[PDB]
């Protein structure tokens, strides 16, 4: 919650949890920035 | 709670007919529309400290008027014409000399 609030109202920036990733948001984004633990959690959830 | 005689009498009636009856020492008032003759007579005697020979009353309906598209009605009124006893002090309306 300390880091989500920081980029919350930046225009063009979209926030979502690793377990809510979806094709529409990925395809609309130009770059996907993962936090390290978020990326590890997403990878672990798929093995 | 307590009743005052001045709640029955509302205003004097100011008109040519009223002014004609002042010369005869007959006074016209607008009274509350649910009073009766005896009540009005008692109230006038108590308020103006004068003898009253008789009281006559009449109801009058309000007029219909249209303003934008539909009629509206004015209030109905009850007038009381009060004639004093032959030899009693005149009532000073304080601004109705006639």
């Amino acid at each position: 919650e300390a880091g989500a609030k920081s980029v919350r109202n930046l225009p063009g920036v979209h926030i979502l949890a690793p377990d809510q990733l979806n094709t529409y948001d990925v395809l609309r984004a130009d770059d996907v920035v993962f936090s390290v633990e978020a990326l590890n959690a997403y990878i672990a959830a798929n093995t | 709670t307590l009743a005052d005689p001045r709640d029955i009498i509302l205003a004097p009636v100011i008109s040519e007919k009223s002014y004609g009856l002042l010369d005869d020492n007959v006074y016209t008032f607008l009274v509350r529309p649910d009073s009766n003759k005896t009540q009005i007579k008692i109230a006038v005697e108590k308020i103006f400290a004068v003898k009253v020979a008789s009281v006559n009353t009449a109801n009058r309906q309000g007029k219909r008027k249209r303003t934008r598209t539909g009629y509206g009605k004015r209030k109905s009124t009850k007038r009381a014409i009060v004639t004093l006893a032959p030899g009693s002090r005149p009532i000073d309306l304080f601004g109705a000399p006639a």
Partner: protein, 65 residues
């Protein structure tokens, strides 16, 4: 007009006389308004409000002040 603070000291009979004389003033104001000699027409509302105030004080007195 008259204040409730300055009305809450009159006992019962001064209240009853203030009521009666205020009613008399209202009667006179009504006749003056009818015959066209009243200039400050805001007096009617003031007298009506002080009469209402006197009733309010009396009623609250007789029901658990």
């Amino acid at each position: 007009g008259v204040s409730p603070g300055e009305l809450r000291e009159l006992t019962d009979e001064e209240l009853a006389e203030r009521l009666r004389e205020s009613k008399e003033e209202l009667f006179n104001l009504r006749f003056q308004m009818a015959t066209g000699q009243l200039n400050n027409n805001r007096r009617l509302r003031t007298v009506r409000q002080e009469i209402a105030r006197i009733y309010t004080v009396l009623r609250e007195r007789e029901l658990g002040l």
